[PDB]
Design an enzyme around this catalytic site. Structure first.
Site, mmCIF file in Angstrom:
data_model
loop_
_atom_site.group_PDB
_atom_site.id
_atom_site.type_symbol
_atom_site.label_atom_id
_atom_site.label_comp_id
_atom_site.label_asym_id
_atom_site.label_seq_id
_atom_site.Cartn_x
_atom_site.Cartn_y
_atom_site.Cartn_z
ATOM 1 N N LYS A 1 0.808 -1.222 0.000
ATOM 2 C CA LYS A 1 0.000 0.000 0.000
ATOM 3 C C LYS A 1 0.856 1.294 0.000
ATOM 4 C CE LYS A 1 -3.918 -2.218 2.413
ATOM 5 N NZ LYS A 1 -4.760 -2.240 3.642
ATOM 6 N N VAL A 2 1.082 1.843 -1.201
ATOM 7 C CA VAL A 2 1.784 3.131 -1.399
ATOM 8 C C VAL A 2 0.750 4.255 -1.374
ATOM 9 C CG1 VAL A 2 3.307 4.510 -2.891
ATOM 10 C CG2 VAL A 2 3.527 2.029 -2.862
ATOM 11 N N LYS B 1 5.046 4.053 2.041
ATOM 12 C CA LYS B 1 4.881 2.663 1.637
ATOM 13 C C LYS B 1 4.601 1.871 2.910
ATOM 14 C CE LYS B 1 6.705 -1.314 -0.831
ATOM 15 N NZ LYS B 1 6.512 -1.621 -2.272
ATOM 16 N N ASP C 1 17.760 -5.984 -8.666
ATOM 17 C CA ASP C 1 16.411 -5.769 -9.229
ATOM 18 C C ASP C 1 16.238 -4.338 -9.789
ATOM 19 O OD1 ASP C 1 13.788 -6.685 -10.006
ATOM 20 O OD2 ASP C 1 12.936 -6.088 -8.077
#
Ligand SMILES: CC(C)(C)C(=O)N1C[C@@H]2C[C@H]1c1ccccc1O2
Ligand SMILES: CC(C)(C)C(=O)N1C[C@@H]2C[C@H]1c1ccccc1O2
Lengths: 268, 265
Positions: B18-19, B33, B126
């Site tokens: 959940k940002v 975040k 990443d």
């Protein structure tokens, strides 16, 4: 790759001097010692040149190599066409505010890198801020303040070969005081002043003892001597960074977090 | 300053998604975040705080700064700085096309940021456009939104293989290196000029995976706009099969910075 490039005098086609390397190009050669050879300190000198080589950053002068020969000792670094910062500020072409903003930011970046690598400059001044043809700067240590053995080598009895305006008050008349990060922050404050003044500070000083004792008492560069439009924020920053008490002065990361958004919104 | 700021939910006036976007009472606009929300479970908090301390060490103009952390009864959040234009791919896919001079600066800023992280012993693992955030003035910051460097927050939290080096495809046991991130940078270089995700957005199937392992790369002829010769050589160099063939980011920066200055700006 990351090792020190050991160079030879015979690599150059042809005492700080301009020097052309046969393959690699135009360079600057600071020849520290010329005289009778002493191989006893060569291991320590080379190890200091190894430490110099580790300090790599776009705003720090790179050591391209070192000449360690029988009697000749030289550091080889990159060419900076426009010379030191004061030479650029005193030039007939006036350097715009946008470039001056970038210079200050680049000095902060460079000093922040060095402090992050455990390096106190001890001798930050316009003479040690070199400028390339595109007005980008690189921080230098031309008097070898951070490098004991090369500094001892330079002042050696057999060798056949400073400005107090940017020195923090705690170091004036006190040889015993160990320099800190905040020592360089003081110097940055006076460099900030110089950039917008376009001159060295304290012009009205008549004697050296007068000046030394004035700075120690709290006297600073004259803000009213700035003829150009300097912003209010920059005047606050230099005032903060030249505080008598070192604990009152910020860190370069502290300076960068304030100055970078200011540079972006106002100066560029 | 210097230590991880433990923040409270009560420090924020509102949190609009959940940002989520969030306004700090004394410190302005931020991004929250929230990693975990629900029943509280202690015996990760010591490790979670220590990982947030590691995040806090990484300060650089091209790296997303952790402004603070919320560790409360049931709620766990990372609080970081706001980047208005979103991720790099959102900016590249936007209706206004970004000029070459800005793209050159982006690449240089990505290099600067990655060079800092490698210098701090941090392999990203990443790197991709989703993890390259962009401010209103088109300056970038590298992020780790999937928490690849931070195991406990990643486990607390709980698929693009296009930027993953072949040595990691079908070898999950392989330890990442600096050269792993350089591969990723090559495909990011491609993405920047292609203005799209590589391999026609094809599902990351065994045919594709094994093609990439064998030598297959993003199609350079799919770049229709003007990409310089130097940049095409750089991506080709940085996506070499052999990791030893690929350069280091300091290696890249030494050549790319003068190229940016002479040609791109
Ligand atoms: C070669 C020379 C001594 C002139 C120099 O300036 N530097 C070498 C490294 C990087 C750069 C430097 C700058 C400032 C302090 C230390 C230092 O150390
Ligand atoms: C807050 C969040 C996890 C999203 C992040 O992006 N970072 C925290 C530090 C600095 C920055 C970061 C980027 C890349 C790798 C580690 C890392 O660690």
């Amino acid at each position: 790759s990351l090792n020190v490039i050991k160079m030879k005098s015979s690599d150059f086609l042809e005492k700080v001097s301009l020097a052309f390397h046969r393959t690699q190009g135009l360079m600057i050669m600071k020849t520290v010692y010329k005289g009778p050879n002493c191989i006893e300190h060569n291991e320590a000198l080379l190890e200091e040149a190894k430490m110099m080589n580790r300090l790599r950053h776009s705003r720090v002068v790179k050591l391209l190599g070192v000449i360690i020969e029988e009697g000749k000792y030289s550091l080889v670094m990159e060419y900076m066409e426009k010379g030191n910062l004061m030479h650029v500020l005193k030039a007939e072409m006036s350097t715009p505010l946008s470039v001056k903003g970038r210079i200050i930011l680049e000095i902060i970046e460079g000093m922040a890198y060095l402090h992050g690598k455990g390096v106190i400059h001890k001798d930050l001044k316009p003479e040690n801020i070199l400028v390339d043809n595109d007005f980008h700067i690189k921080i230098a240590d031309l008097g070898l303040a951070s490098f004991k053995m090369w500094s001892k080598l330079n002042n050696e009895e057999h060798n056949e070969l400073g400005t107090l305006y940017y020195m923090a008050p705690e170091h004036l008349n006190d040889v015993n005081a160990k320099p800190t990060e905040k020592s360089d922050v003081y110097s940055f404050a006076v460099v900030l002043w110089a950039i917008f003044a376009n001159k060295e500070p304290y012009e009205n000083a008549i004697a050296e003892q007068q000046l030394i004792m004035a700075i120690k008492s709290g006297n600073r560069p004259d803000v009213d001597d700035i003829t150009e439009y300097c912003p209010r924020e920059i005047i606050s920053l230099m005032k903060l960074c030249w505080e008598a008490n070192p604990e009152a002065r910020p860190t370069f990361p502290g300076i960068e977090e304030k100055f970078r958004p200011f540079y972006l919104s106002q100066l560029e």
